[PDB]
Structures are given as C-alpha cells and as structure tokens.
C-alpha cells in the first residue's frame, strides 16, 4: 500500500522520490499530500456573460 511520488528538487548536491504509507483507516488522519491543482481566475477576473477578447474594444 505504499505511495511513491516525486519531489520537485530545488537545490542539487534522475527523479528523487519519497514514500508514503497511510497508517490509519480514517482519511482525516492522513497528512496533506500537497499535490494540488491550479485553476484559471476567470470566474472572478472575467465573470462577464459575453467572452472578452483583449485586443478588441471591451464595449462595442
């Protein structure tokens, strides 16, 4: 049940990996993976009904 993931190696001395085994039944007990996703800011930066083309006039 071991999970093997790669580290993003910053300062250097192949891929360096690290290992993780969950010891508990409850997922709440797990550490944080930090394997997170990004999204586009559009729902906040461009919430307009008609798609914005930045080279065009915003008002036409």
């Amino acid at each position: 049940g071991a999970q093997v993931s790669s580290q993003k190696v910053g300062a250097h001395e192949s891929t360096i990996n690290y290992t993780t085994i969950n010891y508990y039944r409850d997922s709440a007990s797990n550490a944080a993976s930090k394997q997170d996703f990004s999204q586009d800011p559009s729902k906040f930066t461009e919430p307009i009904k008609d798609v914005l083309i930045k080279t065009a006039p915003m008002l036409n």
Partner: peptide, 5 residues
C-alpha cells in the same frame, strides 16, 4: 503494493 505518482 505500490502506487506511483
């Protein structure tokens, strides 16, 4: 066994 990401 082992998962790999």
């Amino acid at each position: 066994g082992s998962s790999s990401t």
